[PDB]
Amino acid sequence: AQYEDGKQYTTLEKPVAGAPQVLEFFSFFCPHCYQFEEVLHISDNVKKKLPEGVKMTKYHVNFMGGDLGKDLTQAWAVAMALGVEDKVTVPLFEGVQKTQTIRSASDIRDVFINAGIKGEEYDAAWNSFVVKSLVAQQEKAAADVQLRGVPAMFVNGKYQLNPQGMDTSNMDVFVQQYADTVKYLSEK
Secondary structure, three states, X not given: OOOOEOOOEEEXXXXXXXXXXXXXXXXXXXXXXHHHHHHOOHHHHHHOOOOOOOOEEEEEOOOOOHHHHHHHHHHHHHHHHHOOHHHHHHHHHHHHHXXXXXXXXXXXXHHHHHOXXXXXXXXXHHOOHHHHHHHHHHHHHHHHOOOOOOOEXXXXXXXXXXXXXXXXXXXXXXXXXXXXXXXXXXXX
């Protein structure tokens, strides 16, 4: 066929019941994740092609960057809770990987402050049980698929994207193949 199991996607031997429809994992420490988000705009291009009534979920992971890595998972939980992902994703990626100015939880906090989130509001959220349950959700979803690398995308807890079997000579063409494949998997 044109979309072959084992080629552009793989099927989970241990399918995850009740998983989000489209689930992407990343780390702000992850170089290909920087590419995926900042240069290729994968998340965006997938969303624009998804069927109606199919929502997108994106979670941060702990297994890169040690202590600061975990802080970033909690920060991402704050971002989700306050709904400011689109305001902090770029400065967090650039702070970790471009300027290398994020070295502590306080430096992460600075990014939110600069993005216009009030200090008191950030701190309230950081310290909240709503954010603790969001952190748990992120950890659980990664554990459910025994996740060991990023970037990664799963569809309906049954299918995992396999971009390594795709031509990357043209960035635009790669992105749309990636997006078209998620849409195909979504309709399966």
